[PDB]
């Protein structure tokens, strides 16, 4: 009658998340509240990532998100750079900064 993503109101597939959890060789029994928790947490994290990427795109006056926007969004955010420390973003780079001793006088 009602799908669990519609029932919980989350945008993420609770059924697909639970299906990956059951075949993921983590536990012989997987609870019902855990995929809802996982879907809500990943939904908010993806919403934060898309929000910062949209802010970076509006800074670059583009309505299409490029990985340079994600590169400038993750690394500028402190907790995103701290969590995604070893993450390398494809088609990106570094934050544009100039060292003080390399500056012209």
């Amino acid at each position: 009658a009602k799908s669990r993503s519609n029932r919980a109101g989350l945008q993420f597939p609770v059924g697909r998340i639970h299906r990956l959890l059951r075949k993921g060789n983590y536990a012989e029994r997987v609870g019902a509240g855990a995929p809802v928790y996982l879907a809500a947490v990943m939904e908010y994290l993806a919403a934060e990532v898309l929000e910062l990427a949209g802010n970076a795109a509006r800074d670059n006056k583009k309505t299409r998100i490029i990985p340079r926007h994600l590169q400038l969004a993750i690394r500028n955010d402190e907790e995103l750079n701290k969590l995604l420390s070893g993450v390398t973003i494809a088609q990106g780079g570094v934050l544009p900064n100039i060292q003080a001793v390399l500056l012209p006088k």
């Binding site: 536990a27 509240g33 996982l38 947490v41 949209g54 299409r64 990985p67 969590l83």
Partner: protein, 97 residues
């Protein structure tokens, strides 16, 4: 004849983008890059929950293992936000149940 049914998180996060920035599109290769991001965090914290269930010698993973994985791996406010929305995600999952 199509090749295969490749399942992805394209339309869900596309709806997330449309409810965050309705007038902003996204390139598909950046979409697959952050799909790899989402699946990587899934495989990180699901293994974290499995390890925490192994530490309790428990063969069943509840939402409490996911709570411990969130408050261990996520630093700063992204921990305590994701806990706070994660409890109320359960309650609306158990309201009309």
């Amino acid at each position: 004849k199509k090749r295969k049914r490749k399942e992805s998180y394209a339309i869900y996060i596309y709806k997330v983008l449309k409810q965050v920035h309705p007038d902003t599109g996204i390139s598909s290769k950046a979409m697959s890059i952050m799909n790899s991001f989402v699946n990587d965090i899934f495989e990180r914290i699901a293994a974290e929950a499995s390890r925490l269930a192994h530490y309790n010698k428990r063969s069943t993973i509840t939402s409490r293992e996911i709570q411990t994985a969130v408050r261990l791996l996520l630093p700063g406010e992204l921990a305590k936000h994701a806990v706070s929305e994660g409890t109320k995600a359960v309650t609306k999952y158990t309201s009309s149940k």
